[PDB]
Amino acid sequence: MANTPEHIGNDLKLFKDSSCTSLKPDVKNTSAFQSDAMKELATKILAGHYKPDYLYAEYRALPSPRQTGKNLRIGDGFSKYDNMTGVYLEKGRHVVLVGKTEGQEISLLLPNLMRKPAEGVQPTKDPNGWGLHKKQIPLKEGINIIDVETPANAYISYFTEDAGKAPKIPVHFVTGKANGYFDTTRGDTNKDWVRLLDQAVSPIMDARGKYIQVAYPVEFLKKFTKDRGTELINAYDKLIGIQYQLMGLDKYGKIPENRVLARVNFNYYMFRDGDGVAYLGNDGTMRMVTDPENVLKGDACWGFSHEVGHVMQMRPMTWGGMTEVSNNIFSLQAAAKTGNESRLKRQGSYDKARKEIIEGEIAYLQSKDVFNKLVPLWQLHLYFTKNGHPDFYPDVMEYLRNNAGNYGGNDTVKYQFEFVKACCDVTKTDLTDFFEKWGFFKPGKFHIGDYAQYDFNVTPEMVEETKKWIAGKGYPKPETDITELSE
Ligand SMILES: [Cl-]
Ligand SMILES: [Zn+2]
């Protein structure tokens, strides 16, 4: 009764369709079955209480994270594990039945979320590194025999260009175990959450909200979240939603379908890579990020907002020198929306930046402090928020999505002037003086040290053409000196 493609293939003929969730009406017993896997399934069905949940599901294609990023001019650090199954695969040989693919590329992901450094290895210096290791198995239409060496939650990788059009692909983990998952968009409640954790067969529970996906250990979810899984997911959704709102993605119907992943790791306190945000699986860190109130406080809120803001910061607001500047517009907004302190206020940044840049008569580009560069960007928001344009950044980011050019490396300085034009046009305000005082219009050749090093050439013509363009609009000047705004 071995689970060979020939034994399994013969058995497939006994079920009503390729889902194998029901038997042909003349199949009364299991005497004709050739495979252990399909016989065991048919025995469940014949006994009248088969639960296909999770084990069998149909998977919808998502836009690739890189397409999503390109469309919005932002990063592609969205979840590769978005199509969670709620299926856990024990060590052994598994049978996975895939429906019609129409040649679509589709694979199975088995990440090692519980990977730890070897005994006596310093976690930060792990020779295996800090990345999320996984087995990736290409799937074909039909019978897939998959050898699992270490037990794993399963995730489907199914991404295309034109996701609304691609087929739904059925996948049946015949030999799997239903770990389940928590999904607030499905209507799951705290009752569901407690039951999920109590009956979990994996050390990892998968959960998602509107925008967040989390992959955290059951032990920490029970210890700290306990009861409040809905609140936890809502809190991460609030943090991400704050960025989408500031981006104007809600206003203009452009919230991406892709989730952002926050995961456990066993190497380091907190970091972000291409897979998303990672948090150390110890009591200290897990208390901060698996408790729904703690995740919205101070350092936890800032750290998450700061990192996600690297995915969400758009290229036209993130020219050279701006990598650690434009993402913190999100951090400041998230602090304002969660009742936390202003870090610009706490650092005395308005004063530090006015002294460094305005009094120092340097170019904005030459500023040596990423909080000082953040100051005018935040003053604009605080000003326009009070003076009749509450959708300031939402409209500016939409305008730049639609109108900004396409620049890389040393050419990215052109975005500085495009950003200035966008702010004027959106608000119908002549902001020449504000930007002049903050040194946006200083000509020269500037060498700027970000992660990359930039050589910007701001010519007198570039400055004059921007100023001419603004003057030509005939907008009113603000009544007050916006550079004087402080908290
Ligand atoms: Cl920071
Ligand atoms: Zn950063």
DSSP state of 412: G
98 CA to centre of ligand 2 in angstroms: 41
- Cα 147 from Cα 149, distance rounded (Å): 6
292 CA to centre of ligand 1 in angstroms: 22
Place of tokens 């699986």: 281
Place of tokens 């903050």: 438
Q: Say whether 310 counts as a known binding-site residue.
A: yes
- Cα 171 from Cα 98, distance rounded (Å): 5
Nearest to 204 by CA among 126, 290, 288, 327: 290
Q: Which ligand is nearest to the CA of 302?
A: 1
272 CA to centre of ligand 2 in angstroms: 9
Q: Tell me the C-alpha to C-alpha distance, in Å, between residue 349 and each of 128, 256, 306, 385, 440.
A: 40, 34, 17, 20, 18
Q: Say whether 306 counts as a known binding-site residue.
A: yes
313 CA to centre of ligand 2 in angstroms: 11
DSSP state of 17: S
3-class secondary structure, 458: strand
Contact (CB, 8 A) for 311 and 77: yes
Cα 193 vs. chain centroid, distance in angstroms? 22
- Cα 84 from Cα 215, distance rounded (Å): 10
Q: Which residues pair with 172 in a beta bridge?
A: 56, 97
Contact (CB, 8 A) for 118 and 170: no
For residue 151, how many other CB atoms are within 10 A of its CB?
17
- Cα 61 from Cα 156, distance rounded (Å): 10
Contact (CB, 8 A) for 26 and 8: no
DSSP state of 15: B
Method for this entry: X-ray
